[PDB]
Amino acid sequence: MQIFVKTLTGKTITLEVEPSDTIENVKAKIQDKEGIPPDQQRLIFAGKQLEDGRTLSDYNIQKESTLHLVL
Amino acid sequence: MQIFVKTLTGKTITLEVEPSDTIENVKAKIQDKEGIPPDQQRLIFAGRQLEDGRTLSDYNIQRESTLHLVLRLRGG
Amino acid sequence: MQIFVKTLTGKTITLEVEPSDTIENVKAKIQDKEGIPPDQQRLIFAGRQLEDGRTLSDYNIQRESTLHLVLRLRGG
Amino acid sequence: VQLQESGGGLVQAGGSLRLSCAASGSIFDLGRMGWYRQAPGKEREFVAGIDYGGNTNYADSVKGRFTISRDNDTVYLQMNSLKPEDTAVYYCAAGIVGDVVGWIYYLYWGQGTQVTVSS
Ligand SMILES: [Cl-]
Ligand SMILES: [Cl-]
Ligand SMILES: [Mg+2]
Ligand SMILES: [Mg+2]
Ligand SMILES: [Mg+2]
Ligand SMILES: [Mg+2]
Ligand code: NA
Protein backbone atom coordinates (compact mmCIF):
# COMPACT_ATOMS: atom_id res chain seq x y z
CA MET A 1 0.00 0.00 0.00
CA GLN A 2 1.16 3.51 -0.83
CA ILE A 3 1.36 6.18 1.84
CA PHE A 4 3.06 9.56 1.93
CA VAL A 5 5.36 11.11 4.51
CA LYS A 6 6.03 14.85 4.67
CA THR A 7 7.71 17.29 6.91
CA LEU A 8 5.79 20.57 6.90
CA THR A 9 8.28 22.34 4.60
CA GLY A 10 9.97 19.32 3.01
CA LYS A 11 9.66 16.98 0.11
CA THR A 12 6.92 14.42 0.12
CA ILE A 13 8.28 10.89 0.28
CA THR A 14 6.23 7.93 -0.87
CA LEU A 15 6.50 4.66 1.02
CA GLU A 16 5.40 1.10 0.31
CA VAL A 17 3.89 -0.25 3.51
CA GLU A 18 1.58 -2.94 4.63
CA PRO A 19 -1.49 -2.07 6.71
CA SER A 20 -0.10 -4.33 9.44
CA ASP A 21 3.31 -2.61 9.41
CA THR A 22 4.33 -1.16 12.73
CA ILE A 23 5.32 2.46 13.15
CA GLU A 24 8.77 1.16 13.99
CA ASN A 25 8.85 -0.57 10.57
CA VAL A 26 7.63 2.65 8.91
CA LYS A 27 10.49 4.58 10.51
CA ALA A 28 12.88 1.89 9.27
CA LYS A 29 11.55 2.43 5.74
CA ILE A 30 12.03 6.20 6.08
CA GLN A 31 15.59 5.56 7.21
CA ASP A 32 16.14 3.39 4.12
CA LYS A 33 14.74 6.03 1.78
CA GLU A 34 15.84 9.29 3.39
CA GLY A 35 18.73 8.27 5.65
CA ILE A 36 17.11 9.65 8.82
CA PRO A 37 17.84 7.50 11.91
CA PRO A 38 14.57 6.23 13.40
CA ASP A 39 15.46 7.65 16.84
CA GLN A 40 15.31 11.13 15.25
CA GLN A 41 11.87 10.52 13.71
CA ARG A 42 8.47 11.37 15.12
CA LEU A 43 5.47 10.53 12.95
CA ILE A 44 2.19 12.37 13.33
CA PHE A 45 -1.25 11.65 11.96
CA ALA A 46 -4.38 13.65 12.77
CA GLY A 47 -2.32 15.73 15.20
CA LYS A 48 -1.23 12.71 17.29
CA GLN A 49 2.21 11.17 17.62
CA LEU A 50 2.21 7.54 16.44
CA GLU A 51 3.79 5.02 18.83
CA ASP A 52 6.44 2.60 17.57
CA GLY A 53 4.70 -0.58 18.72
CA ARG A 54 1.40 0.14 16.92
CA THR A 55 0.50 -0.72 13.34
CA LEU A 56 -0.74 1.62 10.64
CA SER A 57 -4.12 -0.09 10.78
CA ASP A 58 -4.22 0.35 14.58
CA TYR A 59 -4.32 4.07 13.85
CA ASN A 60 -6.99 3.61 11.16
CA ILE A 61 -4.52 4.96 8.58
CA GLN A 62 -5.74 4.15 5.06
CA LYS A 63 -4.03 4.03 1.68
CA GLU A 64 -2.57 7.32 0.40
CA SER A 65 -2.67 8.92 3.83
CA THR A 66 0.00 11.49 4.57
CA LEU A 67 1.97 11.20 7.77
CA HIS A 68 3.75 14.23 9.09
CA LEU A 69 7.37 13.71 10.00
CA VAL A 70 9.03 15.89 12.63
CA LEU A 71 12.63 15.52 13.71
CA MET B 1 -3.54 -17.23 34.50
CA GLN B 2 -2.44 -15.70 31.16
CA ILE B 3 -4.73 -14.11 28.58
CA PHE B 4 -3.82 -12.59 25.22
CA VAL B 5 -4.60 -9.11 23.88
CA LYS B 6 -4.35 -8.27 20.21
CA THR B 7 -5.46 -5.61 17.78
CA LEU B 8 -6.84 -6.80 14.46
CA THR B 9 -3.56 -6.32 12.55
CA GLY B 10 -1.02 -6.31 15.38
CA LYS B 11 0.92 -9.06 17.07
CA THR B 12 -0.44 -10.48 20.30
CA ILE B 13 0.76 -9.73 23.83
CA THR B 14 0.04 -11.60 27.02
CA LEU B 15 -1.16 -10.40 30.39
CA GLU B 16 -1.08 -12.15 33.74
CA VAL B 17 -4.60 -11.94 35.16
CA GLU B 18 -7.07 -13.51 37.61
CA PRO B 19 -10.77 -14.25 36.98
CA SER B 20 -11.70 -11.51 39.46
CA ASP B 21 -9.72 -8.86 37.56
CA THR B 22 -11.94 -6.08 36.29
CA ILE B 23 -11.81 -4.89 32.70
CA GLU B 24 -10.52 -1.63 34.20
CA ASN B 25 -7.62 -3.57 35.75
CA VAL B 26 -6.98 -5.31 32.42
CA LYS B 27 -6.81 -1.93 30.68
CA ALA B 28 -4.34 -0.79 33.34
CA LYS B 29 -2.21 -3.88 32.61
CA ILE B 30 -2.35 -3.04 28.89
CA GLN B 31 -1.15 0.50 29.62
CA ASP B 32 1.73 -0.92 31.63
CA LYS B 33 2.76 -3.17 28.74
CA GLU B 34 1.86 -1.05 25.69
CA GLY B 35 1.68 2.56 26.93
CA ILE B 36 -1.95 2.97 25.77
CA PRO B 37 -4.02 4.88 28.36
CA PRO B 38 -7.12 2.94 29.47
CA ASP B 39 -9.39 5.65 28.10
CA GLN B 40 -7.94 5.00 24.62
CA GLN B 41 -8.78 1.27 24.73
CA ARG B 42 -11.88 -0.49 23.46
CA LEU B 43 -11.84 -4.18 24.30
CA ILE B 44 -13.97 -6.81 22.55
CA PHE B 45 -14.59 -10.45 23.34
CA ALA B 46 -17.34 -12.76 22.08
CA GLY B 47 -18.56 -9.99 19.78
CA ARG B 48 -19.30 -7.73 22.76
CA GLN B 49 -17.60 -4.62 24.00
CA LEU B 50 -16.33 -5.31 27.52
CA GLU B 51 -17.48 -2.91 30.26
CA ASP B 52 -14.90 -1.50 32.67
CA GLY B 53 -16.82 -2.40 35.82
CA ARG B 54 -17.26 -6.07 34.99
CA THR B 55 -14.68 -8.77 35.63
CA LEU B 56 -13.10 -11.29 33.28
CA SER B 57 -15.11 -14.13 34.82
CA ASP B 58 -18.26 -12.05 34.22
CA TYR B 59 -17.57 -12.51 30.48
CA ASN B 60 -16.48 -16.18 30.74
CA ILE B 61 -13.01 -15.12 29.59
CA GLN B 62 -10.81 -18.13 30.28
CA ARG B 63 -7.12 -18.93 30.40
CA GLU B 64 -5.45 -18.12 27.07
CA SER B 65 -8.51 -16.36 25.65
CA THR B 66 -7.61 -13.45 23.37
CA LEU B 67 -9.20 -10.06 23.84
CA HIS B 68 -9.57 -7.89 20.77
CA LEU B 69 -8.17 -4.37 21.28
CA VAL B 70 -9.44 -1.43 19.24
CA LEU B 71 -7.97 2.01 19.79
CA ARG B 72 -10.12 5.01 20.60
CA LEU B 73 -8.96 7.65 18.12
CA ARG B 74 -9.65 11.37 18.06
CA GLY B 75 -8.47 14.12 15.75
CA GLY B 76 -5.99 16.45 17.42
CA MET C 1 -21.28 -28.48 17.26
CA GLN C 2 -22.99 -25.13 17.71
CA ILE C 3 -21.14 -21.83 17.48
CA PHE C 4 -22.49 -18.31 17.83
CA VAL C 5 -22.00 -15.43 15.38
CA LYS C 6 -22.61 -11.89 16.56
CA THR C 7 -22.22 -8.31 15.41
CA LEU C 8 -21.31 -5.81 18.11
CA THR C 9 -24.86 -4.46 18.38
CA GLY C 10 -26.79 -7.28 16.71
CA LYS C 11 -28.54 -10.41 17.89
CA THR C 12 -26.56 -13.57 18.44
CA ILE C 13 -27.21 -16.15 15.73
CA THR C 14 -26.52 -19.84 16.29
CA LEU C 15 -25.01 -22.14 13.67
CA GLU C 16 -24.52 -25.90 13.57
CA VAL C 17 -21.03 -26.52 12.19
CA GLU C 18 -18.35 -29.16 12.07
CA PRO C 19 -14.81 -28.40 13.30
CA SER C 20 -13.67 -29.28 9.76
CA ASP C 21 -15.97 -26.69 8.15
CA THR C 22 -14.12 -24.00 6.25
CA ILE C 23 -14.65 -20.36 7.06
CA GLU C 24 -16.14 -20.10 3.56
CA ASN C 25 -18.71 -22.70 4.61
CA VAL C 26 -19.61 -20.78 7.77
CA LYS C 27 -19.99 -17.56 5.74
CA ALA C 28 -22.31 -19.35 3.33
CA LYS C 29 -24.51 -20.18 6.33
CA ILE C 30 -24.37 -16.61 7.65
CA GLN C 31 -25.46 -15.36 4.22
CA ASP C 32 -28.54 -17.60 4.45
CA LYS C 33 -29.51 -16.01 7.78
CA GLU C 34 -28.50 -12.35 7.47
CA GLY C 35 -28.28 -11.87 3.67
CA ILE C 36 -24.71 -10.49 3.67
CA PRO C 37 -22.63 -11.94 0.81
CA PRO C 38 -19.64 -14.01 1.97
CA ASP C 39 -17.21 -11.57 0.31
CA GLN C 40 -18.61 -8.72 2.46
CA GLN C 41 -18.44 -10.68 5.72
CA ARG C 42 -15.35 -10.83 7.84
CA LEU C 43 -15.36 -13.08 10.89
CA ILE C 44 -13.05 -12.20 13.79
CA PHE C 45 -12.02 -14.63 16.48
CA ALA C 46 -9.18 -14.19 18.99
CA GLY C 47 -8.47 -10.80 17.45
CA ARG C 48 -7.74 -12.37 14.04
CA GLN C 49 -9.57 -12.23 10.76
CA LEU C 50 -10.62 -15.77 9.83
CA GLU C 51 -9.29 -16.69 6.38
CA ASP C 52 -11.73 -18.41 4.04
CA GLY C 53 -9.63 -21.40 2.94
CA ARG C 54 -9.00 -22.45 6.55
CA THR C 55 -11.16 -24.60 8.81
CA LEU C 56 -12.70 -23.87 12.19
CA SER C 57 -10.27 -26.41 13.68
CA ASP C 58 -7.33 -24.40 12.32
CA TYR C 59 -8.31 -21.46 14.54
CA ASN C 60 -9.06 -23.71 17.56
CA ILE C 61 -12.72 -22.67 17.42
CA GLN C 62 -14.64 -25.03 19.68
CA ARG C 63 -18.22 -25.59 20.83
CA GLU C 64 -20.02 -22.48 22.11
CA SER C 65 -17.39 -20.14 20.62
CA THR C 66 -18.73 -16.76 19.50
CA LEU C 67 -17.43 -15.38 16.20
CA HIS C 68 -17.52 -11.62 15.66
CA LEU C 69 -19.16 -10.56 12.38
CA VAL C 70 -18.17 -7.29 10.74
CA LEU C 71 -19.14 -5.83 7.39
CA ARG C 72 -16.34 -5.60 4.85
CA LEU C 73 -16.74 -3.08 2.01
CA ARG C 74 -14.44 -1.85 -0.73
CA GLY C 75 -13.70 1.77 0.07
CA GLY C 76 -10.70 4.06 0.19
CA VAL D 1 -28.54 2.33 19.38
CA GLN D 2 -25.12 3.71 18.49
CA LEU D 3 -26.07 4.89 14.99
CA GLN D 4 -29.49 6.14 13.88
CA GLU D 5 -29.95 7.34 10.29
CA SER D 6 -32.57 9.88 9.26
CA GLY D 7 -33.23 12.43 6.56
CA GLY D 8 -34.17 10.05 3.76
CA GLY D 9 -37.29 10.35 1.69
CA LEU D 10 -38.66 10.78 -1.80
CA VAL D 11 -36.88 13.34 -3.96
CA GLN D 12 -37.14 14.32 -7.60
CA ALA D 13 -34.17 13.60 -9.86
CA GLY D 14 -31.77 16.53 -9.81
CA GLY D 15 -32.77 17.50 -6.28
CA SER D 16 -30.74 17.30 -3.12
CA LEU D 17 -31.14 15.62 0.24
CA ARG D 18 -29.07 15.68 3.44
CA LEU D 19 -28.92 12.46 5.45
CA SER D 20 -28.07 12.55 9.13
CA CYS D 21 -26.80 9.92 11.48
CA ALA D 22 -27.05 10.49 15.20
CA ALA D 23 -23.96 9.01 16.80
CA SER D 24 -24.25 7.95 20.44
CA GLY D 25 -21.61 7.23 23.03
CA SER D 26 -18.10 7.17 21.65
CA ILE D 27 -18.87 5.54 18.32
CA PHE D 28 -16.79 8.18 16.52
CA ASP D 29 -13.68 7.08 18.34
CA LEU D 30 -13.32 4.06 16.04
CA GLY D 31 -11.77 6.78 13.85
CA ARG D 32 -13.66 6.17 10.63
CA MET D 33 -17.29 6.77 9.73
CA GLY D 34 -18.93 5.88 6.46
CA TRP D 35 -22.08 5.74 4.46
CA TYR D 36 -22.91 2.80 2.27
CA ARG D 37 -26.12 1.97 0.47
CA GLN D 38 -28.04 -1.00 -0.83
CA ALA D 39 -30.19 -0.55 -3.93
CA PRO D 40 -32.94 -3.07 -4.80
CA GLY D 41 -31.45 -6.36 -5.93
CA LYS D 42 -27.87 -5.11 -5.53
CA GLU D 43 -25.16 -5.62 -2.94
CA ARG D 44 -24.15 -3.05 -0.37
CA GLU D 45 -21.88 -0.39 -1.87
CA PHE D 46 -19.55 2.06 -0.10
CA VAL D 47 -20.61 5.66 -0.78
CA ALA D 48 -18.46 8.00 1.34
CA GLY D 49 -16.11 7.93 4.29
CA ILE D 50 -14.40 10.28 6.68
CA ASP D 51 -11.63 9.53 9.13
CA TYR D 52 -10.70 11.20 12.41
CA GLY D 53 -8.16 13.37 10.61
CA GLY D 54 -11.00 14.83 8.54
CA ASN D 55 -9.91 13.00 5.38
CA THR D 56 -12.80 12.03 3.10
CA ASN D 57 -13.22 9.65 0.20
CA TYR D 58 -16.05 8.84 -2.16
CA ALA D 59 -17.32 6.19 -4.53
CA ASP D 60 -16.55 7.19 -8.12
CA SER D 61 -20.27 7.36 -8.89
CA VAL D 62 -20.91 10.01 -6.21
CA LYS D 63 -17.66 11.99 -6.18
CA GLY D 64 -18.47 15.65 -6.81
CA ARG D 65 -22.16 15.19 -5.92
CA PHE D 66 -22.02 13.87 -2.34
CA THR D 67 -20.22 15.36 0.66
CA ILE D 68 -19.65 13.59 3.97
CA SER D 69 -19.02 15.59 7.14
CA ARG D 70 -19.51 15.28 10.86
CA ASP D 71 -20.18 17.58 13.78
CA ASN D 72 -19.88 16.76 17.48
CA ASP D 73 -22.64 14.13 17.48
CA THR D 74 -23.82 13.64 13.88
CA VAL D 75 -22.47 12.32 10.57
CA TYR D 76 -23.99 13.95 7.50
CA LEU D 77 -24.28 12.96 3.86
CA GLN D 78 -25.12 15.92 1.63
CA MET D 79 -26.42 14.43 -1.63
CA ASN D 80 -26.73 16.85 -4.56
CA SER D 81 -27.80 16.27 -8.15
CA LEU D 82 -29.61 13.10 -7.23
CA LYS D 83 -30.09 10.39 -9.86
CA PRO D 84 -32.58 7.51 -10.07
CA GLU D 85 -29.69 5.10 -9.48
CA ASP D 86 -29.06 6.74 -6.11
CA THR D 87 -32.28 5.10 -4.92
CA ALA D 88 -31.28 2.81 -2.05
CA VAL D 89 -31.39 2.26 1.66
CA TYR D 90 -28.53 4.35 3.06
CA TYR D 91 -26.57 3.20 6.13
CA CYS D 92 -24.12 4.97 8.36
CA ALA D 93 -21.34 2.94 9.87
CA ALA D 94 -18.21 3.11 12.00
CA GLY D 95 -15.16 1.01 11.54
CA ILE D 96 -11.53 0.40 10.88
CA VAL D 97 -9.18 -0.47 8.07
CA GLY D 98 -7.98 -4.05 8.02
CA ASP D 99 -5.20 -6.24 6.66
CA VAL D 100 -5.94 -5.58 2.96
CA VAL D 101 -5.55 -2.21 1.26
CA GLY D 102 -8.73 -0.52 0.05
CA TRP D 103 -11.17 -2.31 2.33
CA ILE D 104 -13.06 -1.08 5.39
CA TYR D 105 -14.33 -3.24 8.23
CA TYR D 106 -17.50 -1.70 9.64
CA LEU D 107 -18.09 -2.82 13.22
CA TYR D 108 -21.29 -0.82 13.77
CA TRP D 109 -23.95 0.22 11.30
CA GLY D 110 -27.42 1.70 11.57
CA GLN D 111 -30.84 0.46 10.53
CA GLY D 112 -30.81 2.56 7.38
CA THR D 113 -32.81 5.38 5.83
CA GLN D 114 -34.63 4.92 2.54
CA VAL D 115 -33.82 7.33 -0.30
CA THR D 116 -35.99 7.21 -3.41
CA VAL D 117 -35.15 9.38 -6.41
CA SER D 118 -38.04 9.64 -8.85
CA SER D 119 -38.28 11.00 -12.39
CL1 LIG E 1 -17.76 -4.27 -1.40
CL1 LIG F 1 -32.42 18.09 2.74
MG1 LIG G 1 17.76 0.15 6.89
MG1 LIG H 1 5.26 -4.42 20.71
MG1 LIG I 1 -13.51 -9.21 17.82
MG1 LIG J 1 -25.61 5.76 -16.08
NA1 NA K 1 -25.06 -19.03 0.82
Gist?
Chain A is built from 1 helix and 5 strands. By secondary structure, chain A is an alpha+beta fold. In chain D, strand 4 and strand 5 form a beta hairpin.
Ligand kinds: chloride ion, magnesium ion, sodium ion
Give the radius of gyration of chain A: 11 Å
What is the count of helical runs of chain A? 1
Distance between the termini of chain A: 24 Å
Largest sheet of chain B: 5 strands, mixed
* Count of folded domains of chain A: 1
As a percent range, the share of strand residues of chain A is 25-35%
CATH architecture of chain A: Roll
Shape of chain A: globular
Q: For the record, what CATH class of chain B applies?
A: Alpha Beta
**What is the percentage of strand-forming residues of chain B?**
25-35%
Q: Indicate the percent of residues in helices of chain B.
A: 10-25%
Structural class of chain A: alpha+beta
Query: Main β-sheet of chain A: number of strands, strand sense, barrel status?
Result: 5 strands, mixed
What's the domain count of chain B?
A: 1
* Radius of gyration of chain B, taken over Cα atoms and rounded to an integer in Å: 11 Å
Number of helices of chain B: 1
Question: Which class of secondary structure composition applies to the elements of chain B?
Answer: alpha+beta
Give the assembly state of these chains. heterotetramer
Membrane topology (chain A): Peripheral membrane protein
Keywords (chain A): ADP-ribosylation, Cytoplasm, Isopeptide bond, Membrane, Mitochondrion, Mitochondrion outer membrane, Nucleus, Ubl conjugation
Subcellular location (chain A): Cytoplasm; Mitochondrion outer membrane; Nucleus
Main location (chain A): cytoplasm
Report what the structure shows.
The complex is a heterotetramer, with one copy of chain A (71 residues), two copies of chain B (76 residues) and one copy of chain D (119 residues). Chain A has 71 residues and is α+β, with helices and mostly antiparallel strands. Helices cover 17% and strands 30% of the residues of chain A. Chain A has a single domain, classed as Ubiquitin-like (UB roll). Chain A contains one helix and five strands. A five-stranded mixed beta sheet of chain A has the order 2-1-5-3-4, with helices on one face. Chain A is globular and about 25 Å long. With 76 residues, chain B is α+β, with helices and mostly antiparallel strands. Chain B has one domain: Phosphatidylinositol 3-kinase Catalytic Subunit, Chain A, domain 1 (Ubiquitin-like (UB roll), Roll), CATH 3.10.20.90. Chain D has a single domain, classed as Sandwich (Immunoglobulin-like). In chain D, β7 and β8 form a beta hairpin. The chains are: A alpha+beta (71), B alpha+beta (76), D mainly beta (119). Chains C and D meet through β5 of C and β5, β9 and β10 of D. β5 of chain C pairs antiparallel with β10 of chain D. Chains B, C: It is found in: Cytoplasm; Mitochondrion outer membrane; Nucleus. Chains B, C: This is Ubiquitin B. Chains B, C: Keywords: ADP-ribosylation, Cytoplasm, Isopeptide bond, Membrane, Mitochondrion, Mitochondrion outer membrane, Nucleus, Ubl conjugation. Chains B, C: Its main location: cytoplasm.
